[PDB]
């Protein structure tokens, strides 16, 4: 994820919202 986001951020981001 070097040119992007982390998964790992983007995951807990989805997590949050529910």
Same mark, same amino acid.
């Given at each position: +994820? +070097?040119?992007?986001?982390?998964?790992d951020? *983007? *995951?807990? $981001?989805?997590?949050?919202? $529910?």
């Amino acid at each position: +994820s +070097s040119d992007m986001f982390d998964v790992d951020e *983007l *995951l807990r $981001d989805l997590n949050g919202d $529910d």
